[PDB]
Amino acid sequence: QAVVTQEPSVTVSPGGTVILTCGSSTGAVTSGHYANWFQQKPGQAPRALIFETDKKYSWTPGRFSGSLLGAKAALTISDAQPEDEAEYYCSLSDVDGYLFGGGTQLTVL
Amino acid sequence: QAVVTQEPSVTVSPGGTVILTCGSSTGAVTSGHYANWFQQKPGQAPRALIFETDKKYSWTPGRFSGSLLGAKAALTISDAQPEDEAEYYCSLSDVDGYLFGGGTQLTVL
Numbered sequence: 001q002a003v004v005t006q007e008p009s010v011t012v013s014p015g016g017t018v019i020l021t022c023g024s025s026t027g028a029v030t031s032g033h034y035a036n037w038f039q040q041k042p043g044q045a046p047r048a049l050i051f052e053t054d055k056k057y058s059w060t061p062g063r064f065s066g067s068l069l070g071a072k073a074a075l076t077i078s079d080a081q082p083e084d085e086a087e088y089y090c091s092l093s094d095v096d097g098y099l100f101g102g103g104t105q106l107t108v109l
Numbered sequence: 110q111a112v113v114t115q116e117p118s119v120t121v122s123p124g125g126t127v128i129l130t131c132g133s134s135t136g137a138v139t140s141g142h143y144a145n146w147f148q149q150k151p152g153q154a155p156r157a158l159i160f161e162t163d164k165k166y167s168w169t170p171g172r173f174s175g176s177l178l179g180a181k182a183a184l185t186i187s188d189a190q191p192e193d194e195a196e197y198y199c200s201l202s203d204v205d206g207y208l209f210g211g212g213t214q215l216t217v218l
């Protein structure tokens with residue numbers, strides 16, 4: 001009966017490291033939720049970045065990694081670049097289906 | 110424009126084995142498209158079934174398997190059960206985004 005939780009907005013300094021987190025409203029997020037992350041720039045088609053908590057696609061920037069941090073799924077963006085300014089969407093899953101968070105708007109300073 | 114193509118409708122008998130395919134209109138499908146498969150039973154929330162072409166979730170019945178077959182991605186359903194009757198969607202992606210096929214209606218009699 002849980003929903004996916006994401007901080008609405010988050011900032012980072014250029015060259016800085018920022019951690020986006022994705023939570024469950026009822027409990028802890030584990031690797032059993034197979035967290036996926038998606039990047040979206042306004043008006044544009046969303047792009048898949050991370051699957052199965054920490055797996056990258058061939059096109060996933062080396063700067064980006066997924067992991068579990070505490071009771072949450074986490075997307076770490078190292079060495080932030082201007083082109084990383086986007087909405088980041090988290091999806092969590094179980095046997096009853098998959099749900100999306102409302103996204104985090106990342107601003108690069 | 111580019112599209113992902115699935116057969117609209119396929120029929121298998123209980124106990125049978127059936128192949129659903131997922132093609133790309135702009136070339137062969139490779140593991141580099143990271144094919145995902147999803148299932149929507151009538152009245153139910155969509156579930157994820159297969160990702161990265163052939164990886165299963167802990168809740169994916171072992172009678173489902175994903176593979177590359179000819180120039181296409183494929184979802185092979187063996188020992189088909191009544192409950193396997195559902196709409197099946199595949200999705201393919203590249204550096205620019207992901208596309209869903211139109212869905213395959215699987216009828217088990």
Ligand SMILES: CN(C)c1ccc(C(c2ccc(O)cc2)c2ccc(N(C)C)cc2)cc1
Pocket residue numbers: 033034035036048051091092093098099142143144145157160200201202207208
């Ligand atoms: C297991 N979990 C949490 C999960 C898995 C896959 C997806 C997903 C997806 C994307 C859009 C959508 O409307 C529905 C699902 C998706 C679609 C395509 C791709 N590729 C790489 C083709 C990846 C993820 C969402 C959540």
